[PDB]
Amino acid sequence: VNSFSGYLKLTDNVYIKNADIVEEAKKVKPTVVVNAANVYLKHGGGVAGALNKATNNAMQVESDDYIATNGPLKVGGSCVLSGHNLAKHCLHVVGPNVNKGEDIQLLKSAYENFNQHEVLLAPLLSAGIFGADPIHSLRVCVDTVRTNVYLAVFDKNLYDKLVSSFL
Ligand SMILES: Cc1oc(C(N)=O)cc1S(=O)(=O)Nc1cnc(Cl)c(C#N)c1
């Protein structure tokens, strides 16, 4: 039993809710919240901009030190950093950005990072400003992640479409 509430069950291990991931994290304080990161950990907009703003920019400060030490992530890769006031940990995961021409097959590699964590609160990778089809992203999620994932979808219209088209 865990504290996630109001989610629709899609599969054995994947759950989904129309929710603001920032507000969801603030209320649940999950062990892991996933950020929709880029390779530079520049949290300017989308989910990343919202999460960073909620930390009063502490996420960005920590991220800049991480990059200065380690260099950029790989597309499809991840790193674990602090969750600040939102979660114990933040798993920064880089899905491909179609608006940069990155290969969409890297989306499966991105979701594989979730399997290193038993339970996660997460957005749909490569959705929103990353330019992928969220229905495709949900399919890859369900077919790749084996751990327990609670997906927060900000847009109600999109949430209803994801549910209604789910196979
Ligand atoms: C309102 C909205 O539109 C779309 C769309 N496909 O156009 C997605 C969303 S979201 O807010 O519900 N989830 C979301 C938002 N931002 C980002 Cl960067 C990601 C990722 N990775 C995921």
From Swiss-Prot:
Catalytic activity line of the entry: Thiol-dependent hydrolysis of ester, thioester, amide, peptide and isopeptide bonds formed by the C-terminal Gly of ubiquitin (a 76-residue protein attached to proteins as an intracellular targeting signal)
Record entry for activity regulation: Inhibited in vitro by GRL-0617.
Bilayer topology: Multi-pass membrane protein
Subcellular location: Host endoplasmic reticulum membrane
Assembly: May form homohexamers. Interacts with N protein.
Main function: Responsible for the cleavages located at the N-terminus of the replicase polyprotein. Participates together with nsp4 in the assembly of virally-induced cytoplasmic double-membrane vesicles necessary for viral replication. Antagonizes innate immune induction of type I interferon by blocking the phosphorylation, dimerization and subsequent nuclear translocation of host IRF3. Also prevents host NF-kappa-B signaling. In addition, PL-PRO possesses a deubiquitinating/deISGylating activity and processes both 'Lys-48'- and 'Lys-63'-linked polyubiquitin chains from cellular substrates.
Name used for this protein in its record: Papain-like protease nsp3
Residues of the full protein shown: 1025 to 1191 of 7096
